[PDB]
Amino acid sequence: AGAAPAGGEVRRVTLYAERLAGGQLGYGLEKGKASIPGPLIELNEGDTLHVEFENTLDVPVSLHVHGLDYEISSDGTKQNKSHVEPGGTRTYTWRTHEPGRRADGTWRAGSAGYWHYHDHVVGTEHGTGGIRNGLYGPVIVRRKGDVLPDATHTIVFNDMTINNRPAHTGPNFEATVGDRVEIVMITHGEYYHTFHMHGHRWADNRTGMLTGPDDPSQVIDNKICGPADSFGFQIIAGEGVGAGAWMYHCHVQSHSDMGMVGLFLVKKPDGTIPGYDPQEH
Amino acid sequence: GAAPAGGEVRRVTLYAERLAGGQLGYGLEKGKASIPGPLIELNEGDTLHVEFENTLDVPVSLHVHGLDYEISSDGTKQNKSHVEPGGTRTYTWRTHEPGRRADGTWRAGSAGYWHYHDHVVGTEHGTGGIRNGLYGPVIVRRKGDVLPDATHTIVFNDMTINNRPAHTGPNFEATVGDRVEIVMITHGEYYHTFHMHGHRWADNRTGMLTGPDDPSQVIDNKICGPADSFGFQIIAGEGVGAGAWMYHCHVQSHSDMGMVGLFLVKKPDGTIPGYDP
Amino acid sequence: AGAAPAGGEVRRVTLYAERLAGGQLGYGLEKGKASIPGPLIELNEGDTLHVEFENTLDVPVSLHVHGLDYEISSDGTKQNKSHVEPGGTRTYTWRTHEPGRRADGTWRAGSAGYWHYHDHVVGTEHGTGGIRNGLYGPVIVRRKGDVLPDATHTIVFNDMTINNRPAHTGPNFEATVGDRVEIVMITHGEYYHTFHMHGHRWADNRTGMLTGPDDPSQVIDNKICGPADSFGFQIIAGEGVGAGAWMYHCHVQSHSDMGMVGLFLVKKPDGTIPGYDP
Ligand SMILES: [Cu+2]
Ligand SMILES: [Cu+2]
Ligand SMILES: [Cu+2]
Ligand SMILES: [Cu+2]
Ligand SMILES: [Cu+2]
Ligand SMILES: [Cu+2]
Ligand SMILES: [Cu+2]
Ligand SMILES: [Cu+2]
Ligand SMILES: [Cu+2]
Structure with a gap:
């Protein structure tokens, strides 16, 4: 039983959306290594992750994440013009924060938990065709000492x-x-x-x-x-x-x-x- | 800032009325029904007597989750607390603070995010009422929230x-x-x-x-x-x-x-x- | 009416699967007395229960429980050969444990809770036909002081x-x-x-x-x-x-x-x- 460290690193990773065998769709860390579920992304609270995303499909694809902090420009939605055209790239930025006491004395909940990322634009503007076909994966954000x-x-x-x-x-x-x-x-x-x-x-x-x-x-x-x-x-x-x-x-x-x-x-x-x-x- | 301790006795008039397109809604004043209905807010300890008037051509009631009420205010046909068309009825809602009981166990207070709705339009579980818009929120705050x-x-x-x-x-x-x-x-x-x-x-x-x-x-x-x-x-x-x-x-x-x-x-x-x- | 004591007793019960009216099926503490839901079983954390089970039906039946500790031979599934042939008997053993710190230093959750048991072999190998017809019942495991x-x-x-x-x-x-x-x-x-x-x-x-x-x-x-x-x-x-x-x-x-x-x-x-x- 190890312990997660305090986070705070800026990290980068490349991610791709690709057609798999049998007409499914997946994310992977390297071309020809897409999987369903997608690769597991692990971070410690305070880490920032810059996801350099490449869309190899013939229709728009996106990347949307639950739980973590992002600005509207990494929403991964058509509504906010954060989807990636056929053949394109876009860097999505995810941030995470530790919990801590606000100035109003309330407690800010941290980013830690069991979260996920998925497509938001294949098939419909809620990613229904993309999710159906395999464009989802896990994200874990660990808290110091987990x-x-x-x-x-x-x-x-x-x-x-x-x-x-x-x-x-x-x-x-x-x-x-x-x-x-x-x-x-x-x-x-x-x-x-x-x-x-x-x-x-x-x-x-x-x-x-x-x-x-x-x-x-x-x-x-x-x-x-x-x-x-x-x-x-x-x-x-x-x-x-x-x-x-x-x-x-x-x-x-x-x-x-x-x-x-x-x-x-x-x-x-x-x-x-x-x-x-x-x-x- | 922060919610105070409660314990006021409050009174409000509520009305059920027909809205545009056949919807049905609760309001604080005639002509002001909304979907969802008006937000009711109380502090644990508070009492609220709802003076309810039904302006529909069908029986309507008011039933609340979470808060304390006696049987004559459960808003059901079963306990004869539905309001005939044109009629009026006062519903009483009460709320309590938490505290330790004598057996050592802790009685939970009323505080929470709750709601009220109809229980008699369409069916005796308010199915048609609820569908048509007869629902609204009730928040009960705890001291210090x-x-x-x-x-x-x-x-x-x-x-x-x-x-x-x-x-x-x-x-x-x-x-x-x-x-x-x-x-x-x-x-x-x-x-x-x-x-x-x-x-x-x-x-x-x-x-x-x-x-x-x-x-x-x-x-x-x-x-x-x-x-x-x-x-x-x-x-x-x-x-x-x-x-x-x-x-x-x-x-x-x-x-x-x-x-x-x-x-x-x-x-x-x-x-x-x-x-x- | 009191508080639960600490457990650690070895207990035994008898349980029967039988037909009821109308093609319902239930468990019973004695033959003739099956009910839906089945009999309440109540234990204190640390208790072991040996359930001496008899299938009085004409198809295989099992007993599977949520929450409690049991070895794989008491799974109550066909897949792990824990089901009971028509007219057969079997003893299913259920254990319970207290909360405490594990060897690795983390906190082990106890067995206490509001749990249940049910058939896992009638109709399908997930007990769909058994559960549908009434082969289910409650188990309560108490924590000292509840x-x-x-x-x-x-x-x-x-x-x-x-x-x-x-x-x-x-x-x-x-x-x-x-x-x-x-x-x-x-x-x-x-x-x-x-x-x-x-x-x-x-x-x-x-x-x-x-x-x-x-x-x-x-x-x-x-x-x-x-x-x-x-x-x-x-x-x-x-x-x-x-x-x-x-x-x-x-x-x-x-x-x-x-x-x-x-x-x-x-x-x-x-x-x-x-x-x-x-
Ligand atoms: Cu989502
Ligand atoms: Cu929905
Ligand atoms: Cu979304
Ligand atoms: Cu309700
Ligand atoms: Cu139901
Ligand atoms: Cu009800
Ligand atoms: Cu089960
Ligand atoms: Cu399912
Ligand atoms: Cu199972």
């Missing part, structure tokens, strides 16, 4: 798919018992969902962990979520429950029946998962 | 915002640095997700973190369903500047079909950069 | 029904002004809902009560919920509002109109309910 995980996995319920995968194709993720595993969970599209994990639970607060015995946050294993909700958490793999093929699914019953399921495959230290037979899943 | 420079009410009623036509806002104006309060209420049949560009708030009572030990989540996108009510204050343009900041339901077809408005945050000189209407 | 209620009532929004009852049949629940009344609220199926109570409000946190003036938890009377969500709370009946037939309902408008409504009948001490006639 617990850092061994692994981070992103699970996007996009309409009736997980990460735009075909029905009943996961994804699955692997850990060893004792691993500190971070989930980022984002929802998109038209439908509400409930995200559930067998054998694991978390706090419904920013970090998904109680800060201590005086934290009143709720502890849950089932979370309602709708389009553009983003939350996250860290769990200790197999804590109190051990190894196995631990299902996660949307708990709306027809949704689980129609493919919104995957596996958190928690292994013993020797690499084994007793009983696990993929033919039975 | 920060007061805003302005309050705006946003209601997602089925696929409309404030019963308005698709893609007609409302828009709400503020100047950079203003302390702006939003009351956000949901009604009808559908779930929604309320999102604002450029701004975020805490998912707790006041929408602001009480300080560095407040573990309330900070969000920009909030799932809501029928009769949910929440609120928050944000500093307009804080860390982001002036501009036309969209807010919208984030369910995709809803935003596409017109559940979208603008939070127009002005520079001090009153202009809005980049804002081509 | 205040205990005078009564506990469970309300489940299962698709468009409450507790799989016919439309417009409540249920109704009775108390006396001043009673400490505990509500367990579970949702299943296909629909989101908003649970609303006239005359009463509760905190959107574990217990439904604020810890004290420093507890930032929201105070609400209207709670969005979806399939497999579970929350609970304790209210003082008629507190600041008095006696009467206090309505509770889903606030999604067509749902209340189509019969997801009941009454919280709060009696005066003489046992009467002002303004209410059957």
Whole structure:
């Protein structure tokens, strides 16, 4: 368990929007390495990120982010002329801030949390065609002293798919018992969902962990979520429950029946998962 | 500045009337009904007697979330507190401060972002009333709560915002640095997700973190369903500047079909950069 | 009526899946006595429960629980070979733990909460047919020092029904002004809902009560919920509002109109309910 540092760096990254195989659309850090979800962008509170965005598609595309600070010119919307023409580039600037006491004595909430970025202009002026086809990704903004995980996995319920995968194709993720595993969970599209994990639970607060015995946050294993909700958490793999093929699914019953399921495959230290037979899943 | 302790007995006249295009609304005076209805504001301890007159050709009622009331003011047919056409009735709403009970447990106060609506037009759950515009906000403040420079009410009623036509806002104006309060209420049949560009708030009572030990989540996108009510204050343009900041339901077809408005945050000189209407 | 003690007991119960009238299915503490929702199970953090389960149905059934600790062999899924053949029995073991600091120094959340159990194999391998027909029930896990209620009532929004009852049949629940009344609220199926109570409000946190003036938890009377969500709370009946037939309902408008409504009948001490006639 590492700790996030205080932020304040100016960082740059290149991002591209590209057609994938099978007619999907994705963001990536380098040409031909686009993915759904898009790449995970990580920052510490006070960091600034300059996203040099290139649009390789034949229609306008944009980049809009939740949670973080930006000026209207990096809104990523047609309304504010912040979309990128076919073949074009544009640098979007995202800023983040620490919490702190205002002059009026109130508390400014910081930028930290589990956030996301997505297209705002493909298909419609709300990015509906862009989101449908894969133009979304995760952003984590860490607070000084936050617990850092061994692994981070992103699970996007996009309409009736997980990460735009075909029905009943996961994804699955692997850990060893004792691993500190971070989930980022984002929802998109038209439908509400409930995200559930067998054998694991978390706090419904920013970090998904109680800060201590005086934290009143709720502890849950089932979370309602709708389009553009983003939350996250860290769990200790197999804590109190051990190894196995631990299902996660949307708990709306027809949704689980129609493919919104995957596996958190928690292994013993020797690499084994007793009983696990993929033919039975 | 800050809300005082409450404990005044307040009285107000409210009327239900027909508005243009067959809508129905609450107002403080005859001819002044609005959708949403007028904002009622109280401090915990306060009492409010609402002298309600029904000018419609159908029974109408007044039902309130969150506040204390006796059965004879629940605004239902069940407890005979609906108002016949042409009739009058006084509804009594009370509110209380928090404090410790004798068993050691803490009684929560009335404070919050609440709402009132009809419970008898169309059905005995007010379905047709609510659909037609018979709803409005009620804020109950706790002693010491920060007061805003302005309050705006946003209601997602089925696929409309404030019963308005698709893609007609409302828009709400503020100047950079203003302390702006939003009351956000949901009604009808559908779930929604309320999102604002450029701004975020805490998912707790006041929408602001009480300080560095407040573990309330900070969000920009909030799932809501029928009769949910929440609120928050944000500093307009804080860390982001002036501009036309969209807010919208984030369910995709809803935003596409017109559940979208603008939070127009002005520079001090009153202009809005980049804002081509 | 008291406070929860610290747990750490090994307990056992017997539970049966059986048919009920009309093709409903339920769990029961004894054969013949299945109910929908199933029997309330209550534990104190640290307790272990061995559930000695029998399937009296003609199709496989299972028992799966939210929140509690269980090893993979007690998953209650076909996928991990934890289901029960027709006429079969199996012991499912559920454990619970206290909050405390982990080895890595962070705070481990305890098992306490308002949880639930349900079938995961009837109709589909997510229990869709089981849940639909009534194979679900409440579990409460208490934290040492939690205040205990005078009564506990469970309300489940299962698709468009409450507790799989016919439309417009409540249920109704009775108390006396001043009673400490505990509500367990579970949702299943296909629909989101908003649970609303006239005359009463509760905190959107574990217990439904604020810890004290420093507890930032929201105070609400209207709670969005979806399939497999579970929350609970304790209210003082008629507190600041008095006696009467206090309505509770889903606030999604067509749902209340189509019969997801009941009454919280709060009696005066003489046992009467002002303004209410059957
Ligand atoms: Cu947007
Ligand atoms: Cu789903
Ligand atoms: Cu968005
Ligand atoms: Cu009602
Ligand atoms: Cu919507
Ligand atoms: Cu209501
Ligand atoms: Cu499951
Ligand atoms: Cu409902
Ligand atoms: Cu479940």
